[PDB]
């Protein structure tokens, strides 16, 4: 079912969050997490994924 010829990709996993999740927490925000001192300000640039 979930293995499509051509590439299933409809499924995502949060990769860069700030802190560890609480039990049974559901996080849906998609804000750009800053991977560095320089703030992202949304800009998906360097140190921003």
């Amino acid at each position, epitope marked *: 079912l979930d293995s*499509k*010829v051509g590439g299933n*990709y409809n499924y995502l996993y949060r990769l860069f969050r700030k802190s560890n999740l609480k039990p049974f927490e559901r996080d*849906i925000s*998609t804000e750009i997490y800053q991977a560095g001192s320089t703030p992202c*300000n949304g800009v998906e640039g360097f140190n921003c*994924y």
Partner: antibody
Amino acid sequence: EVQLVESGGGLVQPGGSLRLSCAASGFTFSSYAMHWVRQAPGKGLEWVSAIWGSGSNTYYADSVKGRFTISRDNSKNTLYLQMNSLRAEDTAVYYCARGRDLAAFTKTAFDVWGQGTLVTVSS
Amino acid sequence: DIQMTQSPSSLSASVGDRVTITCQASQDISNYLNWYQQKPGKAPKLLIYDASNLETGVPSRFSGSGSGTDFTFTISSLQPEDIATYYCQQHDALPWTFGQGTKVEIKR
């Protein structure tokens, strides 16, 4: 109210370049997936490209693979479409649509469908 | 890719008649198929998503059905503003393809 006001279409010679814009207002732009779909004059619908938020998970239709580049914007919240090496077969009206495939597995469809911009590849 | 042999290419029906437009599939795409209504000079409008769920803000006379590789699609009451061309769009395998489309017009 969701509003996808499109612009940037116009007249281009074959082999040229053109950038389309798709502004968004009334909803969280950074949390939705945006697509581009074109329709040849008097013909059926053909998908073009899709970008699911990230600046690396971009996917294009087989007919435009390599030639078309998709990009988005924060702040003012707009969507862009880079077109390169256009041919006579590329003349179509380009639409930007919505999509919440991210989390929602129900509204997989294109919730809004902008009004579209006309691009003509001719000298 | 996924091919749709949407048939008939065109059919004639009168006001109030029941309309069915078939949309096939390739490999058991379940219910990842959408339906679209398009008027001349107008942008496409969603009609049925996930093959059964009607969109919000749409009159209840529009309904869809089917799953897997066959999709039936059923119109209950024709209205004079319902004249348009309808397209079925697969949304399973890296959604690319649409349907060829069937032109539905009022029999007179």
